[PDB]
Write an enzyme that holds these catalytic residues in place. Sequence first.
Site: not given
Ligand SMILES: NC(=O)c1ccc[n+]([C@@H]2O[C@H](COP(=O)([O-])OP(=O)(O)OC[C@H]3O[C@@H](n4cnc5c(N)ncnc54)[C@H](O)[C@@H]3O)[C@@H](O)[C@H]2O)c1
Length: 315
Positions: A122, A57
Site C-alpha cells: 500500500h 482504512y
Molecule cells: N493508494 C491506494 O492503493 C488507493 C488509494 C485510493 C483509493 N484506493 C481504492 O480505491 C477505492 C475508491 O477510491 P475512493 O473511494 O478514495 O474515491 P472515489 O473516486 O471512488 O469516490 C468515493 C467518494 O464518491 C462518492 N460516490 C460514489 N459514487 C457516487 C455517486 N454515484 N454519486 C455521488 N457520489 C458518489 C463516495 O461515497 C465517496 O464519498 C477506494 O475505496 C479504495 O478501495 C486505493
Amino acid sequence: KLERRELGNTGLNLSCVGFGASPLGNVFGDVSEEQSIATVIEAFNQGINFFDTSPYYGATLSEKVLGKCLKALGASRDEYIVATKCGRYAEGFDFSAERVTKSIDESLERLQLEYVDILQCHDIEFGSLDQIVNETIPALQKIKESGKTRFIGITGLPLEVYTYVLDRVPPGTIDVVLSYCHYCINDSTLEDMLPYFKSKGVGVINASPLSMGLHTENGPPEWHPASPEIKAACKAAADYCKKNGKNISKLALQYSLSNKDISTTLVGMNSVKQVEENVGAALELETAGKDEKTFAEIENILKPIKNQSWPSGIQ
Ligand SMILES: NC(=O)c1ccc[n+]([C@@H]2O[C@H](COP(=O)([O-])OP(=O)(O)OC[C@H]3O[C@@H](n4cnc5c(N)ncnc54)[C@H](O)[C@@H]3O)[C@@H](O)[C@H]2O)c1
C-alpha cells in the site's frame, strides 16, 4: 449483465466496476454497519464481484466491516474476489517482511477468510523502493506460496514508482498493480503507463474515478489534496452538469470505464443508491454509449488543469 474483464495473467474475471470498501471504514463520513452490509449485498446482487480494502482504512475497521458484509452474502467463495493491502497502518508505514507476514494473518482474521485473492503493498512511494524490491515483495511471494493470498501487487499515486519496482523483479513476479486518480475526467495519465504495464504482463486496477469526490455534486472533502485550481475547475464541471440536468458522477465513472485495457475501476461506495447509480452507469454505457456533447464540454472546462496531480510520498 455487468461486463467482466480478465485481470492480467491471474485468470480472474473482475466486474468492470469494483467495490472500493474504504468508505466502510468511515473515510468519507460515518456509515452504519447495517447500511454497509446492505450496500455490499446489493453490489453483489448487481453483478459486482471484486472488493478492495486495506488495514489502513478506518484503523482496521474497513476490513472488520467488509468481513461481516462478505459473510452476509451467503455465496460461494469463488463468486467474489477480495483484495487487501499491507505496509500502511494507522500507526504508520512498515514494509518489513516481518510486518507484512503478520499483517496478512491480522487481515484474514478481520475479514473472516481463509485467503484473500490479492494482497498488495500500500502506497509504496512512502517507503524505500529498494526495500520493496528486495524485502517486501519476496515476503509477499512467500505469503502467496503459503496460500493466504493468491496474487500479489503494488499500489501508489505516482506513476513513476511502478517502473522502479517492475524493472527490478523477474518477469511474472507482480500479478497486479492498482493506480488511483489517474484515469478520470481530469487526469488520464494512467493511459500513458498502460503500454508499460502490458509489457510487464500485469493486470491493471484503476481506482477513484470520482477522484475522491471531485466529480460529485457535493464536491470534494475538505482534506482533498488537489490544488485550489483543480478543485475550481472540477466544481465548474459539476455545476455545468447540474445546470443541464446531467449527473457528473455518472459521466465521470463512464469515462473511467471506457478504456478496456483496465480490468476494473474501484469506486468507493457507502449506500445502495450509489451502487444502483454506479452499476446503472456501467450498464447504460454498454447500451446507450457516452453523452459525447457533455463530455466535450466537460473536457473544455477541465482542460487548463488536465493531468495535473499533487505530491505524495518521500521519493
Ligand atoms: N493508494 C491506494 O492503493 C488507493 C488509494 C485510493 C483509493 N484506493 C481504492 O480505491 C477505492 C475508491 O477510491 P475512493 O473511494 O478514495 O474515491 P472515489 O473516486 O471512488 O469516490 C468515493 C467518494 O464518491 C462518492 N460516490 C460514489 N459514487 C457516487 C455517486 N454515484 N454519486 C455521488 N457520489 C458518489 C463516495 O461515497 C465517496 O464519498 C477506494 O475505496 C479504495 O478501495 C486505493
